[PDB]
């Protein structure tokens, strides 16, 4: 019945069964460099106002119930800036998350009247929802996640279905849903190119 | 006879020579598609001959060429297709598909150099020499010169061979799947450029 | 009698008849790239403390009463940074707005003691009028403009006659009215050069 | 006899040769008008001959030249008039009008190159070769050398022909009206430079 | 008896006679480019807590009582960033102000523990005096200077003797008084080089 | 019994005897350029909540009790950004401080989820301790240090043992203690290379 | 006979030639170790001969080479060891120690020049000429060419001599102790690069 | 006989040749005075001959040279004295005064060029050719080579003549008083550099 369902290592089968459709997802790590900074938390939400928070142990390389969800082509995974998380999940578990919807790419493609494409600003404008970023820069490898860390992790996925729905309607209205879908199809490759060593260059540029 | 010249569109007879992949480049009045009109489209089937099609100011149709560009059964090979795909969509409304880009391929496998232009690729990969002297000529000239026609043909005459060599390197070095995904995105990348995202990576934060 | 007169598609003939002289004008769009971001609103004021707000539909390419006002050489159009709006109006309707007075160019030419040439700062110093920029970055394509969007649109044109008058007096006092008038005569060409593809370069520079 | 040399001002007799447009350039002690004085003004009527006028330190009048510069009935042709118009206004108080600038014209039509200098324009458009060797000489020298006089004349001898070729390109490519509006603004752009706006586009936000 | 003695055109002989020693001085203009932006106000203080504020008219090229003070080698002129004001005064009146003490140069040479060398920060640290910069960016050519403009002009010179005295003691303590004096001797040339056309380059650099 | 024990010139033998293990240490100077800006204060703490504050006189080149502590290989010296202080101490006294632990290097090596590696931010996150930076940019050469300067100097060393202990545990947890120890072994050379003339280049780069 | 070629690992017999310091360089597919695989390791004992070891894709062991790299009794000499030490650790898991880097040495003593590459060092310090023509070749080629083998050997043949000359300069100019401390840190600097600190000095504020 | 070589200090006999202005330059181990020691001081009286003084590591005195440098009755001529004045103060504690700097003079009068180095000044102003080949040599060498001695002498042999030509231009173009004030500040500018203000103009806001 909990708003924040906590797991160690992997999601339970009962909680994975809550996800009959799209899966909202984010991760927390020790930093922005996957080969240096380990995966610490994976958080998920089915869009019903509750979330799963999964603590990932140091050195952990399998999470079979979660990994099946990530690879399942029948269920879309929704991220805000999936470029990073898709890379972290491939680096850690060897899974290519697919198919994906990225609300940051979607924001860039339809919220053409602003330069503010972060999650907090998207949720404020599109949903009139306030989230706090205070815990983004904390030690996510802690043995005991703090109440504030659990709040942040859950709130970071609780609103992604609703945000995707609003941005999808804007993309359809403004004629860019096809462009968005092509971006989402390339996103796992973009993440893998980062891991391989092209993380600071646009492969489509001249240089 | 190795450079077949056409006004406006390739003939149906010459289009029928293209039984497989189509090497393609364009020439324009500059690097800004909405400012700098398409002036030439050049094609080769990889048999050592080329078709050079001169495009008129204001021309909006080229039915035989457009059918080739849209034909999903025949790959189109470009060097830096990001630009030409945008120009072709801007001019004719056609989305060229499917594509292979030898510049993207070069960037993904020739990791030991920063020289990814066509001339350098042709020299290293094929020992073929081309001259870039006519690159900055007036492609809207009333009469294209013999030097211009030779330059335009040379930009397409070797793309099948270059594609094959770079594909072998992509296989050897493990990046053929990444290259194919880049090629699948390339028409969208070109369309995003036309809409004013030309100086930003849509996959970056900004 | 309304302070904010609302129109769909075009201004009414009765309201266009209010403009016996200069026309204060601005636009709202989906962003700063005319070939990508459609025109959404045109707002006008005759300088009497009231404004016309005209919602422009997606795909709309004619607005005959408005376009006649924009092209009428007998009535000056007053913009703050007309470089953008003149381009948007030419892109959308094919009209070359003329003649124009730009209060941003005027500010740059006479308010030589400051680097703050935006509308809010000009209105504060020159008129002791406060305006809020909160709604500048909103979805101007909304089917129902919000009360805050209507306030912003109206306030954005309500003070331009008064601002033009103050800046004109400063330009005369400080000896730069001729320079300003030459800038205003070039402004439609500058806007058209942006649309053609020179939007990021000064055509008068070496490169 | 093809380079007519004058001290201070052109003679009335030689000014009367100019029945139409006046090609014009200047030489100075550098690129900062309030620091670097005007040293030479060079003119050509487009007939293959030039007038070279040497300007003295502190000279504030040149009545025959100033009458030509202000005469609204005769166009003045410059390559990058933005600079010379400023120098002439700073020195003599004259606003040169009306003007044609071949550098603005080049930027508006030679969209396929970044080379908009005079030497490159003359080579592409006219197959005329000029040498820039004396560009960085001391133009305030007590005696101008034959090389300096040849350089100064060559900067004006071809501007009518270059104007005509670039005008044809502006017609072909649809930008003659934009060019004319730029020329109408150019004297104001030059005056804004003298006032300290030389490093900013007055039409930008900043 | 006034704290702020106002003058039009030139200081009176009676008020110039108050200055038996160093003269604290600043100017106000229409901006930072002397050939474009006219001199509007010259303000002076003898260090006794009162100031002279002299309005300079458009086109005015003489101010004989003031100019004698500026040129008088027997009385030091104290500026905060005299590089600018010395240039403006030479451009306007043809006078080379000498000798000078610049409290900004002095601050840079002895307040080596901070990057904040403006007047407000110097007065706060060295004298525990607060001044407001609100009126720095105002129209100084106004026919009627506002009460706030008069306050700003006076406060800008009221504390310069005291600031010079504190910074002089620091320069002596820390061994850099000779360097400071050499900088002050070069300052009029530095100002003149700005007017001539070297305003954006250090003449002592390679380029 | 004092929380802040004050010394002129050198620490007393009795107070040096308090340091049976690691020595927390910082300095204050007239600025960031050792050849220009003299050493003014050395502050130490044994980690018991009290500190020694030693005023260094102008021109002073010996401090034998302090220098013995700095050179003693049996006692670690703990700095936050020791690169600077190690250089200042070598420049002033000729002593090579060794061995060292730098909490800024340690922070950069383990607090990989943040870009905020200053002392104030480290103490806030790692210890929930607040310090004020108000007095960092003050005149540290004053004959009479102010109460606020004494507070700042003491608080700057009071928490370094505790910070070192927390960061050491993080470095061990995250696998980078060996990297940190190698950085600390190079740190005196890095400081000396700064003094010699390589202060603006990484000697390990290509250029 | 002066270039001994090996597949995969140096032979035990040839490793036994190395009684003292070991000059070493590598060749790769580019400058990003996790992207661009190790292709060649080249060694010299300083006797005018070299061992060139070609490394296979996916190769993770080279026992004789790794024993040399880890042997604390024999110094390894590199020019810009920061890169090669990282590549060797990434590929084989070995931490090369102890090391001398002639590029660090050059930066610490050749204070009158910005030219710290190997070719310039060899020319000034030894009057030895090497050519960099094969620097940007495909080092993963199925067969390394004679030019590639000569280039690879020349990169190690002179490092003992260069080390000796630069050591003399470090003694003369007072920086040998600083150099030795840099060499002691160099393996850590290389490991920090692999972890993503490659564009930051860990000793700076940021 | 035209290059008189000295160890440590000029002889009293050769110092007595200098009855007027003293042309002077130095050579060092690089551009950072506290890192890169003074190695050579070269002087000329303007008579076509030079004194070259080799400076030892750690040398802190040179009494005859220092007396010349401090002598207020004899001007010292440098090209970019900002550097050498700092090196001489750092090494010997002497404040060289009074000075003329031909690089400052060049910047104040050769307003039509960005080429203010010595070689370019000597070529334009005197038609004298010097070669910069030894600029980046090891000036702390145990034996200075004939090429080094020729380079060092050539840096001072023409400074009187260059000073005279640039002074004439400063007179012509109205900036001799500004130049003299710059020269009066130059020793302070050099001392501020040594104190860490070397990358900032003390007269700027920051």
Q: After which residues is chain B broken (C to N over 2.5 A)?
A: none
- Show residues of chain D in contact with C117, CB under 8 Å: 205-206
Order of strands across the sheet that contains D38-44: D3-7, D50-54, D38-44, D22-28, D76-78, D99-101
Option in E115, E179, E203 nearest H182 (CB): E203
- Show residues of chain E in contact with D198, CB under 8 Å: none
Query: Cα G162–G168–G171 angle (5° rounding)?
Result: 140
Indicate yes or no: CB of F174 within 8 angstroms of CB of A141: yes
- Cis peptide preceding C99, ω within 30 of 0: yes
Beta strands in chain B (DSSP E): 3-7, 22-28, 38-44, 50-54, 76-78, 99-101
| Distance of residue E80 Cα from the nearest chain F Cα, in angstroms | 20
CB distance C41 to C140 below 8 Å: yes
Rounded to whole angstroms, the Cα distance separating C44 from F143 reads 68
- Cis peptide preceding F67, ω within 30 of 0: no
Tokens of F199: 């202060």
For C10, residues 6+ apart whose C-beta sits below 8 A from its C-beta are C54, C63, C64, C65, C66
Rounded to whole angstroms, the Cα distance separating F38 from F93 reads 12
Mutate which of D57, D136, D147 to disrupt the H interface (most H C-beta within 10 Å)? D136
Rounded to whole angstroms, the Cα distance separating A136 from A157 reads 13
Helix (H, G, I), strand (E, B) or coil at C107: helix
Q: How many CA atoms lie within 13 A of F171 on its CB side?
A: 23
CB distance F61 to F92 below 8 Å: yes
Q: Is B49 exposed, middle or buried (0-12, 13-18, 19+ CB in 10 A)?
A: middle
User: In terms of residues, how long is chain D?
Assistant: 206
| Distance of residue A82 Cα from the nearest chain B Cα, in angstroms | 10
Indicate yes or no: CB of G34 within 8 angstroms of CB of A33: no
Q: What is the CA radius of gyration of chain H?
A: 16
CB distance E108 to H202 below 8 Å: yes
Rounded to whole angstroms, the Cα distance separating G128 from C186 reads 64
- Show residues of chain D in contact with H113, CB under 8 Å: 136
Q: What is the DSSP string of chain D?
A: --EEEEESS--HHHHTT-SS-EEEEEEESSS-TTTS-EEEEEEE-SSS-EEEEE--TT----HHHHHHHH-TTS-EEESSHHHHHHHHHHHH-----SEEEHHHHHHHH-TT-S--SHHHHHHHHH------TTTTS-TT-SS--HHHHHHHHHTTTTHHHHHHHHHHHHHHHT-HHHHHHHHHHHHHHHHHIIIIITTS-TTS--
D204 touches chain E (CB under 8 A): no
Query: First CA to last CA across chain E, in angstroms?
Result: 53
H to C contact (≥3 Cβ pairs closer than 8 Å):
no
F152 touches chain E (CB under 8 A): no
Rounded to whole angstroms, the Cα distance separating D108 from F174 reads 60
Rounded to whole angstroms, the Cα distance separating H25 from H55 reads 13
| Distance of residue E109 Cα from the nearest chain H Cα, in angstroms | 8
Q: Which of H160, H193, H141 is nearest to H49 (CA)?
A: H160
Q: Any alpha helices (H) in C28-176, and if so which ranges?
A: 64-71, 82-93, 103-110, 119-127, 147-158, 160-174
CB distance B135 to B35 below 8 Å: no
Option in G32, G35, G196 nearest A33 (CB): G196
- Cis peptide preceding E99, ω within 30 of 0: yes
Tell me which residue has tokens 């204050």. F28
Rounded to whole angstroms, the Cα distance separating D144 from C199 reads 43
Rounded to whole angstroms, the Cα distance separating B197 from A117 reads 15
E137 touches chain H (CB under 8 A): no
Helix (H, G, I), strand (E, B) or coil at G180: helix
Task: Characterize the bridge pairing of strands F23-29 and F39-45.
Answer: antiparallel
CB distance F110 to F174 below 8 Å: yes
Residue C188, H or E segment: helix C177-193
Q: How many CA atoms lie within 13 A of G113 on its CB side?
A: 18
CB distance D9 to D65 below 8 Å: yes
Helix (H, G, I), strand (E, B) or coil at C4: strand
Option in D111, D115, D124 nearest B29 (CB): D111
D192 touches chain C (CB under 8 A): yes
Tokens of C96: 């070359």
Rounded to whole angstroms, the Cα distance separating C80 from C74 reads 20
Rounded to whole angstroms, the Cα distance separating H103 from F65 reads 52
Tokens of C120: 């809010």
Neighbours of C195 (CB within 10 A): 17
Rounded to whole angstroms, the Cα distance separating B133 from B148 reads 9
Indicate yes or no: CB of G112 within 8 angstroms of CB of H29: yes
Indicate yes or no: CB of D191 within 8 angstroms of CB of C179: yes
Indicate yes or no: CB of C206 within 8 angstroms of CB of D182: no
CB distance G163 to G98 below 8 Å: no
For E191, residues 6+ apart whose C-beta sits below 8 A from its C-beta are E82, E83, E84, E86, E87, E90
Q: What is the DSSP string of A114-137?
A: -S--SHHHHHHHHH------TTTT
- Show residues of chain E in contact with F37, CB under 8 Å: 112-113
Query: Greatest CA span in chain A, whole angstroms?
Result: 53
Rounded to whole angstroms, the Cα distance separating C13 from C66 reads 9
CB distance G157 to G181 below 8 Å: no
| Distance of residue C93 Cα from the nearest chain B Cα, in angstroms | 18
CB distance B109 to B125 below 8 Å: no
Helix (H, G, I), strand (E, B) or coil at G126: helix
Rounded to whole angstroms, the Cα distance separating E33 from F179 reads 54
- Show residues of chain H in contact with G111, CB under 8 Å: 29-30, 32, 35-36
B188 touches chain A (CB under 8 A): yes
Phi/psi of residue A28, each to 5°? Answer: -125, 145
Chains that touch D (3 or more CB pairs under 8 A): B, C, E, H
Q: Which of G101, G59, G56 is nearest to G76 (CA)?
A: G101
Rounded to whole angstroms, the Cα distance separating D137 from D131 reads 13
* Alpha-carbon torsion, ordered C135, C138, C144, C148, to 10 deg: -10
Q: Which of B19, B4, B98 is nearest to B53 (CA)?
A: B4
Contacts for D190-195: CB closer than 8 Å, 24+ residues apart: D190/D81, D190/D82, D190/D83, D190/D85, D190/D86, D190/D89, D191/C179, D191/D86, D191/D89, D191/D95, D192/C179, D193/D33, D193/D82, D193/D86, D194/D33, D194/D34, D194/D86, D194/D89, D194/D90, D194/E35, D195/E33, D195/E35, D195/E36
HEC states along chain H? Answer: CCEEEEECCCCHHHHCCCCCCEEEEEEECCCCCCCCCEEEEEEECCCCCEEEEECCCCCCCCHHHHHHHHCCCCCEEECCHHHHHHHHHHHHCCCCCCEEEHHHHHHHHCCCCCCCCHHHHHHHHHCCCCCCCCCCCCCCCCCCCHHHHHHHHHCCCCHHHHHHHHHHHHHHHCCHHHHHHHHHHHHHHHHHHHHHHCCCCCCCCC
CB distance D23 to D133 below 8 Å: no
CB distance E158 to E51 below 8 Å: yes
Q: What is the CA radius of gyration of chain A?
A: 16
Indicate yes or no: CB of D30 within 8 angstroms of CB of H111: yes
Q: Which of C125, C131, C18 is nearest to C75 (CA)?
A: C18
Tell me which residue has tokens 């030690």. A139
D140 touches chain H (CB under 8 A): yes
Q: What is the DSSP string of chain A?
A: --SEEEEESS--HHHHTT-SS-EEEEEEESSS-TTTS-EEEEEEE-SSS-EEEEEPPTT----HHHHHHHH-TTS-EEESSHHHHHHHHHHHH-----SEEEHHHHHHHH-TT-S--SHHHHHHHHH------TTTTS-TT-SS--HHHHHHHHHHHHTHHHHHHHHHHHHHHHT-HHHHHHHHHHHHHHHHHIIIIITTS-TTS--
CB distance D88 to D193 below 8 Å: no
Neighbours of D143 (CB within 10 A): 7
Neighbours of E132 (CB within 10 A): 11
Residue C53, H or E segment: strand C51-55
- Show residues of chain E in contact with D34, CB under 8 Å: 35, 196-197
Indicate yes or no: CB of E112 within 8 angstroms of CB of F30: yes
Domain extents for chain D?
1-206
F to A contact (≥3 Cβ pairs closer than 8 Å):
yes
Q: Which of A175, A164, A27 is nearest to A100 (CA)?
A: A164
Rounded to whole angstroms, the Cα distance separating B183 from B81 reads 9
Chain E residue at shortest CA distance from D31? E197
Option in H107, H114, H206 nearest E203 (CB): H107
Rounded to whole angstroms, the Cα distance separating C140 from B180 reads 39
Percentages helix, strand, coil for chain F (3-state, rounded to 5) are: 45, 15, 40
Indicate yes or no: CB of H203 within 8 angstroms of CB of E193: no
For D26, residues 6+ apart whose C-beta sits below 8 A from its C-beta are D38, D39, D40, D41, D42, D84, D87, D88
Chain H residue at shortest CA distance from G175? H35
Rounded to whole angstroms, the Cα distance separating C161 from C79 reads 9
CA dihedral sign, ordered E186, E192, E198, E200? positive
| Distance of residue A17 Cα from the nearest chain B Cα, in angstroms | 32
Indicate yes or no: CB of A203 within 8 angstroms of CB of B80: no
Rounded to whole angstroms, the Cα distance separating D112 from D120 reads 13
CB distance H82 to H165 below 8 Å: no
Tell me which residue has tokens 């010249």. B5
Rounded to whole angstroms, the Cα distance separating E149 from E134 reads 9
Tokens of D85: 């118009």
Q: Which residues pair with C78 in a beta bridge?
A: C24, C101
- Show residues of chain F in contact with A59, CB under 8 Å: none
Indicate yes or no: CB of D185 within 8 angstroms of CB of C187: no
For G114, residues 6+ apart whose C-beta sits below 8 A from its C-beta are F207
Q: What is the DSSP string of chain E?
A: --SEEEEESS--HHHHTT-SS-EEEEEEESSS-TTTS-EEEEEEE-SSS-EEEEEPPTT----HHHHHHHH-TTS-EEESSHHHHHHHHHHHH-----SEEEHHHHHHHH-TT-S--SHHHHHHHHH------TTTTS-TT-SS--HHHHHHHHHHHHTHHHHHHHHHHHHHHHT-HHHHHHHHHHHHHHHHHIIIIITTS-TTS--
Rounded to whole angstroms, the Cα distance separating C202 from E8 reads 43
Q: Which of E35, E44, E38 is nearest to E12 (CA)?
A: E44
Chains that touch A (3 or more CB pairs under 8 A): B, C, F, G
* Segment 67-126 of chain D within 8 Å of chain B by CB: 111-113, 115, 124
E36 touches chain D (CB under 8 A): yes
Tokens of D52: 């070279």
Helix (H, G, I), strand (E, B) or coil at B157: coil
Residue B164, H or E segment: helix B159-173
Mutate which of D106, D107, D110, D112 to disrupt the B interface (most B C-beta within 10 Å)? D112
Query: From its phi and psi, is residue F49 left (phi > 0), alpha (psi between -120 and 50) or beta?
Result: left
CA dihedral sign, ordered A74, A79, A81, A83? negative
Tokens of G39: 């292709």
Option in H107, H114, H192 nearest E179 (CB): H192
Q: What is the DSSP string of F107-172?
A: HHHH-TT-S--SHHHHHHHHH------TTTTS-TT-SS--HHHHHHHHHHHHTHHHHHHHHHHHHH
| Distance of residue C195 Cα from the nearest chain B Cα, in angstroms | 8
For A1, residues 6+ apart whose C-beta sits below 8 A from its C-beta are none
Rounded to whole angstroms, the Cα distance separating F183 from B197 reads 43
Rounded to whole angstroms, the Cα distance separating E177 from E106 reads 9
**Experiment used for this model:** X-ray
Chain A residue at shortest CA distance from G192? A36
HEC states along D17-75? Answer: CCCCCEEEEEEECCCCCCCCCEEEEEEECCCCCEEEEECCCCCCCCHHHHHHHHCCCCC
CB distance D139 to D57 below 8 Å: no
Chains that touch B (3 or more CB pairs under 8 A): A, C, D, G
Query: Cα F107–F112–F117 angle (5° rounding)?
Result: 40
């Amino acid at each position: 019945a909990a708003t924040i369902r906590y797991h160690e290592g992997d999601i339970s089968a009962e909680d994975a069964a809550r996800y009959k459709g799209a899966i909202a997802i984010d991760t927390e790590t020790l930093g922005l460099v996957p080969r240096r900074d380990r995966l610490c938390v994976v958080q998920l939400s089915s869009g019903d106002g509750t979330a799963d928070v999964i603590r990932i142990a140091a050195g952990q390389k399998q999470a079979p119930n979660l990994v099946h969800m990530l690879a399942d082509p029948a269920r879309q995974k929704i991220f805000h800036y999936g470029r990073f998380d898709i890379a972290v999940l491939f680096h850690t578990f060897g899974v290519t998350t697919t198919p994906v919807f990225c609300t940051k790419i979607a924001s860039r493609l339809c919220r053409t009247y602003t330069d503010r494409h972060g999650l907090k600003d998207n949720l404020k404008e599109m949903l009139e929802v306030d989230i706090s970023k205070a815990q983004q820069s904390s030690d996510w490898a802690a043995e005991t996640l703090s109440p504030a860390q659990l709040e942040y992790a859950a709130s970071d996925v609780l609103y992604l279905h609703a945000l995707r729905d609003k941005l999808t309607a804007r993309l359809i209205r403004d004629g860019r849903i096809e462009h968005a879908d092509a971006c989402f199809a390339f996103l796992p490759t973009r993440a893998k190119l980062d891991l391989l060593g092209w993380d600071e260059t646009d492969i489509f540029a001249h240089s």
